[PDB]
Amino acid sequence: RFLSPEFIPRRGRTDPLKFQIERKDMLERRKVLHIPEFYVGSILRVTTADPYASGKISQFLGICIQRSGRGLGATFILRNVIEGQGVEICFELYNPRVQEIQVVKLEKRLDDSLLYLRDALPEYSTFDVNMKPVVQEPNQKVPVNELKVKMKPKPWSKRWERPNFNIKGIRFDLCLTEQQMKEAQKWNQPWLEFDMMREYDTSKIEAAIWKEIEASK
Template sequence: MAASIARGCQAAKGLGPSFRSARALLPVSTSVASRVLAGPGRRQITGPSEPGVFQPPPKPVIVDKRGPQRRESRFLSPEFIPPRGRTNPLKFQIERKDMLERRKILHIPEFYVGSILRVTTADPYANGKTSQFLGICIQRSGKGLGATFILRNTIEGQGVEICFELYNPRIQEIQVVKLEKRLDDSLLYLRDALPEYSTFDMNMKPVAQEPSREVPINQLKVKMKPKPWSKRWERPKFNVKGIRFDLCLTEEQMKEAQKWSQPWLEFDMMREYDTSKIEAAIWNEIEASKSS
């Protein structure tokens, strides 16, 4: 019995090397090979050609079609609206027809008081027969063909203002260098402000702006020169918001200016000028002129 057990143990010892050699000849699985190559401190290496690799789906793009579409804003130049109190609109209707014909030749862009413009005009006495002027728009006035706008710039320490007629046939180009608004509808007080607020480079490059974006409002408040000023800008009738009065006037002077206030005018309904119907009729004229 003992002899048979001893022969069995010797046979098992003889089969051990043969099993180890056969195992070395077998192909190693990809999972084991990847673990061996990666090591304990590296990530597992898997190529895109492997059949079992997970491919994440593409990120979905969700478009909300329920929301309202952005409407294209329409800008009606203020000179198209006739002044209040005119009972015979024939004159302004004829002028609007001429204005629309002029706009087919000259592109008049959208601009406001506070925008920086460059205007090119025909000048028979200048080099190249044209002259340019760049400045900030400080006022828009006039109705119909008599509409005007004033540009101001400081050149060599001297304030220069030019009043252009909007529909002047000498104007060759009106370029908006920077489109923006200010806190006030009139910037005539820049004449009494420090010159740095009306100084611009004549070679200033245009500032790009998205058409669908709203026109930005510049919240800048200017510092004034010492008195006397051209007008009493601190009085309530001017309703100026773009001046730092706290730096140039005392409390007593501000209280004295408030004595001229007329707070009841804010609630006077007869002073309101409803132009909604007039604007709708003018837009119909503009659309008809485009189709003709």
């Protein structure tokens, strides 16, 4: 029972009718392209249509580092290293240019946002472009890969050791001296996990979303 995050809407004040029209159009787009199931950390191959060519097809294989957005525009970022150059591309799912999306290796890592790979060593983000899929048992939980990573030394792009990121996929004991984990832990905010009123309870919403999705068949 996995409901892709797009259909779960941000907490706000928008009118439910907007989300109903949004979902209607989305589901009407899911029946011309199979939008597979992929978690952040998976490996995808996206096949799209070149707008600047005369009708050519473009393939790009990478790791889904971030999955954000909602509604008919939500996207995912694919990171890869080609010829030693680290590229990313932000792909919109429901765009009418993406021909297909192969889940080439369905995985799931400790953190829900693999942005720090921009700092990890180049080989923790390199993948072979021409690499074949890997099967998986249907009634099997999505594997939880455990790969802690080793960082480029000094200037991290976004200062990952802070508590507010809560990243659990980096080897801090190596690159950061014991002292630096005491100044970078005075920002802990022990009250933020126990704030009962910041919790977006989305059970009664995902239930109705499932009613809608299944009825749209």
